[PDB]
Design a protein around this ligand. Structure first.
Ligand code: ICS
Ligand code: ICS
Ligand code: CA
Ligand code: CA
Lengths: 479, 522, 522, 478
């Protein structure tokens, strides 16, 4: 690889293209790792505004709320409140899997909107939203609640979605959740998470506070922050219930409103995506006394560690079902390693993803003998960067809110074997002859969580990295 | 569990008994789900006439739209100019979405930038974002031109694009002669097609508005072609191919075809091909200007006619047999070039295909949706083939357009059971295909969930989707196809007749049950 | 019964209860049919390894062949010559069949004559049929040339075509210099492809054998291209287009593309286009001769090498990436023309599609059949895509070919579970797709009954057919497609990846059962 | 239309292109109808050899045996004995519909062949044929008989398929039918019908001569010569059984060998296609005393005529049920005429088909107010032309073994609205802008027989003749 001095010169060189204001900012968001450093704030800043005109990969607060947290909740209807675009571009873009009868009792893949026109902008959309709610009620009678996911203009025109919500909520005896996730708020998808978690807290989570009819057990848990991309949350749950636990809720992939309302009854919150759901987790501890812990179901090494950390919170019966689960899956993952590690050993991976995966997947790569030479996040905060620096090797590259230009130039120099990032990056790198895997949507593959996902992840990394197509980019008459 | 030599992804992994049992536990234990008889009852109801009438009485709620928003169009329009960066003044989340949208359709890179207006700028304006943004983007990606559009945030707070760009030049953020054409493109007016018109009109204005003195109509001997919002590569290529085949001097104004189809040869090419600045500046000297998609190029037409003084011909989109004929005779008339034997032959070949395939097409019933020009072209061609368009849906359609379509349907015996719907969505369409079942749908990928709904009612109710339009996300490389001219007509006919023949083979594939009609020859 | 406004054809008319009842009556009363349980038991048995072993032990019986006979091939070859009438010396039933065959695949007229030998001539020879035949055909259809082949009757009785044709000239039935090339084409030797090769060599001989004295290799600066038995119009067209794109002088020797695609314009054109007589005469003066389908152009190769003294290059069929690369590089080398930017980009575009589509292709298992060159090209391209060609069948293949294909499979990790079968038929193939089930079959229409068989065992056992080859009778206009060059590579890739995606959509279309994996984006 | 003098001049003109020998022959095969003429041999000759090199539409004796007569018989395996062509070109070409489990108990769409190579031609294929029989027996055990359909070279090399068949017939206890339908025999598909009817008679038909165990009734019939194209025989049968008859056999569409074996037990043979099956019908009358009659299930008029003639052969109970059948379908066919006749009225059709249809379909065209201005046959004998000349109008054109060149020239002048013929003609006339319906394969539609067929026939004639495509052939700039 590269010396510290070389990477540090790579940074300086890439940044010489920018005007000084953008240069001085960018400098702060690109770091060369030191895995001793436990205080991320020493080396790199995060969660600041994007520089204008630099082709950030970031999304918006609406994407964070509607696209990420609320969207997946299958038996509510979720309204895209604003013009036609945002709901349309997100419609079915994210493989938050669920079981249901879509259009009848479940509604995830559908796009409900208010389709704001100029009359709504000039005169407000509160009466439109109120008539929209009655229309939803007549035509989708089996919905179990509604949310109202605000797009940019709502707050800008002075609409009062909170009042509509409580008035119609009372009239219909229904939970209607106003979410102020307008895209100008904050700097990325991140504030949307926060906003969305605060809306769950205020309008939903409290509903069974006085209800003592749920029959709970010592082994009740919630999977918090797993949105079941290709079935990941499923492939996680099966391991927890094989271990003897009772998974009462999933937030929010294959998730229902009743399961969210029952979450305050659990004994432990198992949080996967800390970035998105550390808000509500802290609330549930303050209010209900429910402890929470971070875990990692990416590759055998991390899964085994998590399974054992989780069991140790319980009694010996759970701790030995744990060892039985681990013994059961041992031959399966060992075979996946034996098959694929020889095909991937020594190969170098660069990542760029959103708020978790850029760290969480590192063990899985290492379990196939691969090296993550570079990683970064669109919208992490410094508590994510604290957790990353330990998981990366010395002199590796760290980038926050990377520009298109930067990422391209970093690849040209580092020359990784495999890039994992998103849809707006994939076609770029493919043309440079670098294998690319989509590490949000899993290229339409997965699950990657658990022991069953590992086998798919390993198959996928190999199918792409060693594909015959990559040898064919030079015309033989230009060799 | 996984067998390492036969690894299962989500399908079919989650069909394993152990995941079936766990999913059953989850439901019963915690989901508080409506009984399945009740889900069955509500399903049957969403398929009825009663439900359809309630469905069509909606005033406030849109479900499953069939349009996008203006700036999507402005981006596409801007990508067709040489070394041009699409630049959308407003919120960054829009641009993430535009990019990914086109990424999934074209499976290519789509370059576009935002100036990342936040809550700060929602109050004091985004003037600073535009100065720094313009400066940043010119320095980093080195376009020769930046083509500016707007998100609904900038619209709502009233940002003055003209003043913001002029002040960016006066304070030295970008050079005075660096071309920054713009267009306000509010997402709460019209649709994506309207943004394309607005952007194009902005760029024509930038390059010609103040230089009309030296212009003389017809002095360059070319015909300008404005393609409009176009997302099939073959459409741009067919139009260029036919015009060079006739020897006709032309200028295709907004030509994205190269940048949406760069080769995978070791290099990323951020910019490729595209209409040049000099072509836009010289455009007023054309013999005339032809609009391929006139139903969403009205603003552009007014400018071309009012300022360039071109007598824009009254042509339909060149789709199907009659309208491609009309296009070619009009190009011939304007240019003085005869229609060459090669295009007469191609026409005849198309006719020949119609003759070989008419017996399977005859009377087949379609539902279909899309953008207004595309939809009317498809309706026209279906009528030429002896097919019955039954349910014709244009969500971004207007009353004048609907009138024009209704007159087309009235000129044909095959239009008698056809209704045109403007302002309605795919949840409206889903009702129509249950209550008045057609043989197929012709539409974009969203349509897959309608087909899924119909199959749930029963195999006999299923209405299969034939993918033609935008976006197509669940098949590969169909964006390389052609819908325009004799060429695209040939491709449509082939897909139609073979969709029918595939479905027949499916219906007759049952051993000793239906395979009596499973013929080797059709 | 019929409802006059919704008339039913055979499907679904005969599913009505009263026809069902009547069909049940006929069976019970009179057909003495085996019991259904016994049909089921025997069916299950035809699906097994035990049956396969018996199936592969056949030496005498052929069931569902995947080849036709020589004179089919001779007719196609002859049709590619300017104003030429294919004329088959022998029985009339052969020609009716040849015509109908090609008529169904091309959906065009296929003109060809017989001299209608009967039992009289089976005993005294068909010399009179040839004298009258040649005279009648020349006077009635006015060819500029009559290209003669033979049916198995004429071969068995030993008609000397050479002496019959010379005696036709001597007695004044046709003029001395009227061109009448011939070839003996015995149906009990090789196959349709061998007939093409014999006819072509015969025409080449007719026009050059006795005029070699004044010839100088490379004096015309052209490269001859011999296409072989080819039934996709796009193959002829692509080869011509690429060569013209490189500025390469060429002669396509046997060029049926025009007569197989005449316009429906009010007139019937018995003859159109085609290689001219002067082209065949001047062929020895070419720089070289390229054989697009060398595995069935062996006789032609011997003649071109031995008499024209061309150093025929050792090229495979220009199919897929590597072999189109090789073709182009060889043409560039022989011609001195560089490969142009436009072809390098087209190549890069193909690579790009491969890169976008690799994840759905990887590891997909194919069974496939066809003519030797087509099959090896397809095997080669599958390997490039990362697919596994498991059952490779060529009924007219030979041992040398099978060795060549085996070497191709051993050069790739994707060849490891592949076996190449020569001399076997579609009944052999049907056993293979039960005992070692692939994901799809790639083949011609006959394959549709294999898929029908597999679906009968169960939905999980169904092997869908992707139609590529000859004949294709149950879909329209596929014969306009391209399988050669980067173009054909792009069309094959797109059909493969979308057949996979269509089948996945089918599998995941089940509401609340499998529709969790019914993704809008793939 | 044209005067007799005009048509007669048309004939002359078209024939001037021929050499004298082909001209003198062709002259005898082309006539201007005179519908009083009861003896067809006065106006036109038929069933002679094709002139060489004139592009006949004709097929061969193999096609008349294997393609036409035996092929359809569903529970027997039929062997194309010879090289690989013939069985490959007629594999699944003909829409002889049947019910069965193909590859298991039925075999119609499959191609079984000896695939002759050079060693077989030089040394004979008799030992190959005997080994092929045993392999058929191992791999297709539920087959109930085998036929061996000789291709051209079999007779030419002196192979003895008769002896193989008796020997293997005896070893395996199976009916094995040698058929000498080699393509050089005769002049067309016709001799193959004859040859095949003679093979049925000799090897199959007599098998239950001494079996008395079949329970017969007064109302037992067989449908002789309906090969069930698109279901035509099914759509005929339903009507006969509705009329109270018991249809014991169909020859040979959806046909079984046991139904052929039971046919000698019936009371009457209902012969549709006279050309192909008058041979065996004549035999069954000579040998078994079973009477036979011709009928026509094309269009309401002919079908009503046929149901009533058939009925009158039986008692008052069948004649009564007849009038109830007729009564029941009256509104259905009347609605078809109401709907379609106004769309097709006065339209002119030219036909050219094989050996029946060129006459049998005329009433159904007339039931839609159409005029057959011209017709002819590939392989008719003069007994067919006898039966045609009444059914055609004065001064209409008649052609036998029409050449390609002839038929084209005749259309150019007559300018019909609609031409109905086969696959080797369709694409020619489509490019001329003349609507064309395939009148063998029904253009992948049908049935056309009976009252259910008529509705389809009518829909089909209209769908094509009035299709929008036909107005587009001339570029508007010409
Ligand atoms: S939520 Fe987040 S971007 Fe924790 S907004 Fe994003 S389905 Fe990413 S790195 Mo797309 S914080 Fe989930 C995420 Fe990570 S959409 Fe998915 S992949 S783990
Ligand atoms: S048998 Fe005959 S040619 Fe009577 S050889 Fe031919 S299925 Fe024709 S006019 Mo194709 S005597 Fe049948 C016939 Fe008529 S094949 Fe069909 S249509 S009624
Ligand atoms: Ca691409
Ligand atoms: Ca055709």
């Amino acid at each position: 690889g590269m010396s510290r001095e070389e990477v540090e010169s790579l940074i300086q060189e890439v940044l010489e293209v920018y005007p000084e204001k953008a240069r001085k900012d960018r400098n702060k968001h690109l770091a060369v790792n030191d895995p001793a450093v436990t205080q991320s704030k020493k080396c790199i800043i995060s969660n600041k505004k994007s520089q204008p005109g630099l082709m950030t990969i970031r999304g918006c607060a609406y994407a964070g709320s509607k696209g990420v947290v609320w969207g997946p909740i299958k038996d509510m209807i979720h309204i895209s409140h604003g013009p036609v675009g945002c709901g349309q571009y997100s419609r079915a873009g994210r493989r938050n899997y669920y079981i249901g009868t879509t259009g009848v009792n479940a509604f995830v893949t559908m796009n409900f909107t208010s389709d704001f026109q100029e009359k709504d902008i000039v005169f407000g959309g509160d009466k439109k939203l109120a008539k929209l709610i009655d229309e939803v009620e007549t035509l989708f009678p089996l919905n179990k609640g509604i949310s109202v996911q605000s797009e940019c203009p709502i707050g800008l025109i002075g609409d009062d979605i909170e009042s509509v919500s409580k008035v119609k909520g009372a009239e219909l005896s229904k939970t209607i959740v106003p979410v102020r996730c307008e895209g100008f708020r904050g700097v990325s998808q991140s504030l949307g998470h926060h906003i969305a978690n605060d809306a769950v807290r205020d309008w939903v989570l409290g509903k069974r506070d006085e209800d003592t009819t749920f029959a709970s057990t010592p082994y009740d848990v919630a999977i918090i922050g797993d949105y079941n991309i290709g079935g990941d949350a499923w492939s996680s749950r099966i391991l927890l219930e094989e271990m003897g636990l009772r998974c009462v809720a999933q937030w929010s992939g294959d998730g229902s409103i009743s399961e969210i309302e029952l979450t305050p009854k659990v004994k432990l919150n198992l949080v996967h995506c800390y970035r998105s759901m550390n808000y509500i987790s802290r609330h549930m501890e303050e209010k209900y006394g429910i402890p929470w812990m971070e875990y990692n179901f990416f590759g055998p090494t991390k899964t085994i560690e998590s399974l054992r950390a989780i069991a140790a919170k319980f009694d010996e019966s759970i701790q030995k079902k744990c060892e039985e689960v681990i013994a059961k899956y041992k031959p399966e993952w060992e075979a996946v390693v034996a098959k694929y590690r020889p095909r991937l050993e020594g190969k170098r991976v660069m990542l760029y993803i959103g708020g978790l995966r850029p760290r969480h997947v590192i063990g899985a790569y290492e379990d196939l003998g691969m090296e993550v030479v570079g990683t970064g996040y669109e919208f992490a905060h410094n508590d994510d960067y604290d957790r990353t620096m330990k998981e990366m090797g010395d002199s590796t590259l760290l980038y926050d809110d990377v520009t298109g230009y930067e990422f391209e130039e970093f690849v040209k120099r580092i020359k990784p074997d495999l890039i994992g990032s998103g849809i707006k990056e994939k076609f770029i790198f493919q043309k440079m002859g670098i294998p690319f895997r989509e590490m949000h949507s899993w290229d339409y593959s997965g699950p990657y969580h658990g022991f069953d996902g590992f086998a798919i992840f390993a198959r996928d990394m190999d199918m792409t990295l060693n594909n015959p197509c990559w040898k064919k980019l030079q015309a033989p008459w230009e060799a | 569990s996984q067998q390492v030599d036969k690894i299962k992804a989500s399908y079919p992994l989650f069909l394993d008994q152990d995941y079936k049992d766990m999913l059953a536990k989850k439901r019963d234990g915690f989901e508080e789900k409506y009984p399945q008889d009740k889900i069955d009852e509500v399903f049957q109801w969403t398929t009825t006439k009663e439900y359809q009438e309630l469905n069509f009485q909606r005033e406030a709620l849109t479900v499953n739209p069939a349009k996008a928003c203006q700036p999507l169009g402005a981006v596409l329009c801007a990508l067709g100019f040489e070394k041009t960066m699409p630049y959308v003044h407003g919120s960054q989340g829009c641009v993430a979405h535009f990019r990914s949208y086109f990424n999934r359709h074209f499976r290519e890179p789509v370059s576009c930038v935002s100036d990342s207006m936040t809550e700060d700028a929602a109050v004091f304006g985004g003037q600073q974002n535009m100065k720094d943004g313009l400066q940043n983007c010119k320095a980093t990606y080195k376009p020769d031109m930046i083509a500016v559009s707007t998100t609904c945030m900038a619209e709502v707070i009233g940002d003055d694009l003209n003043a913001f760009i002029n002040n960016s030049k006066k304070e030295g953020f970008i050079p005075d002669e660096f071309p920054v054409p713009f267009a306000h493109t509010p997402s709460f007016v019209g649709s994506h097609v309207t943004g394309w018109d607005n952007m194009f009109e902005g760029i024509a204005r930038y390059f010609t508005l103040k230089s009309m003195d030296d212009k003389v109509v017809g002095s360059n001997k070319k015909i300008n072609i404005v393609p409009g919002f176009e997302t099939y590569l073959g459409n741009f290529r067919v139009i260029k191919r036919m015009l060079s085949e006739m020897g006709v001097g032309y200028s295709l104004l907004s030509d994205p075809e190269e940048v949406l189809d760069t080769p995978a040869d070791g290099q990323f090419r951020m910019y490729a091909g595209g209409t040049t600045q000099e072509e836009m500046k010289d455009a007023p000297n054309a013999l005339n200007t032809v609009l391929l998609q006139p139903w969403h190029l009205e603003k552009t037409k007014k400018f071309v006619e009012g300022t360039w003084k071109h007598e824009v011909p009254k042509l339909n989109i060149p789709m199907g047999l009659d309208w491609t004929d009309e296009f070619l005779m009009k190009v011939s008339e304007i240019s003085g070039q005869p229609i060459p034997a090669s295009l007469t032959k191609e026409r005849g070949r198309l006719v020949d295909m119609m003759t070989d395939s008419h017996t399977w097409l005859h009377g087949k019933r379609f539902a279909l949706w899309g953008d207004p020009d595309f939809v009317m072209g498809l309706v026209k061609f279906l009528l030429e083939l002896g097919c019955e368009p039954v349910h014709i849906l244009c969500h971004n359609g207007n009353k004048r357009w609907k009138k024009a379509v209704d007159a087309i349907l009235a000129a044909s015996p095959y239009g008698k059971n056809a209704t045109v719907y403007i302002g309605k969505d795919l949840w409206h369409l889903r009702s129509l295909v249950f209550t008045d079942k057609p043989d197929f749908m012709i539409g974009n990928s969203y349509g897959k969930f309608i087909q899924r709904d119909t199959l749930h009612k029963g195999k006999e109710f299923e209405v299969p989707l034939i993918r033609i339009g935008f976006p197509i996300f669940d098949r590969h490389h169909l964006h390389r196809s052609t819908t325009l001219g004799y060429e695209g007509a040939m491709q449509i006919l082939t897909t139609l007749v073979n969709s029918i023949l595939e479905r027949l083979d499916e219906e007759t594939r049952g051993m000793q049950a239906t395979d009596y009609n499973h013929d080797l020859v059709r």
